[PDB]
Design a protein around this ligand. Sequence first.
Ligand SMILES: CN1CCN(C(=O)Nc2ccc(F)cc2)CC1
Length: 284
Amino acid sequence: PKSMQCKVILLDGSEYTCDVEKRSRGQVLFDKVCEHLNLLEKDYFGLTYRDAENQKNWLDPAKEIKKQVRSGAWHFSFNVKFYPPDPAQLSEDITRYYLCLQLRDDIVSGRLPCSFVTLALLGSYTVQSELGDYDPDECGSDYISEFRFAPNHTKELEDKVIELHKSHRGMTPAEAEMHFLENAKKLSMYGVDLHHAKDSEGVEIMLGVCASGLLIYRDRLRINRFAWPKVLKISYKRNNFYIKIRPGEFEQFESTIGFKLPNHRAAKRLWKVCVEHHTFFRLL
Ligand SMILES: CN1CCN(C(=O)Nc2ccc(F)cc2)CC1
């Protein structure tokens, strides 16, 4: 029974390797990775792979791995797929831990923009969780953490992490990880999956997919929002993506809104993540 080697980049940056039968569905690999991670609250997570265009795609757990990775390597990342709006409602501390690891990469990568002060506060909770109580012996006036806190590190930011770390004496890792999440969850781009697009006029916009709905960023001023309940149908056709809005009160007709994506693959990818978010966040 022929098996393919799988390599999975974990959220701590280490690599998990296993074998699966070459006709295996994504769920088989996902279950192995989650068992490795001692993760029970699996519904928030997924595996990603890179397609022939180097775009990130979710591995569909219901479909054969081979039919998704096609010509590419059996190389994956383990990621948060659905960011919980209220991480305090998760059952297990270990779930919150993996969500913290993801958010730390979202911040360092610049996917999740963050003020100086919030970068320093999030850093201070990570330091408290991972080293415990502040110790002056380790950190002199010239201290620079090994910890990556931001897309760009400054001495000022390092100083502020240390100043806030001092305030967290007695804080336990789950407690510090919960404070991390109570701050991160409020950030305007928390759990927003962004897609480059053009409006029905050719104006370059961003489409954001998240728990609360579909966001349209037409620049720093003029952000439109479509809550998931207000969306009856998501469709794609060639390079175009469409949302069918419920009729407003006393309105005769549904309304359909159309966008232009980079290519057909990008339209199908945006369609699939919207359908998935709509289904996931509808239920809980
Ligand atoms: C396999 N499904 C996954 C979706 N669904 C669920 O509970 N979603 C959810 C929404 C929002 C939240 F914050 C947590 C979970 C039930 C089982």
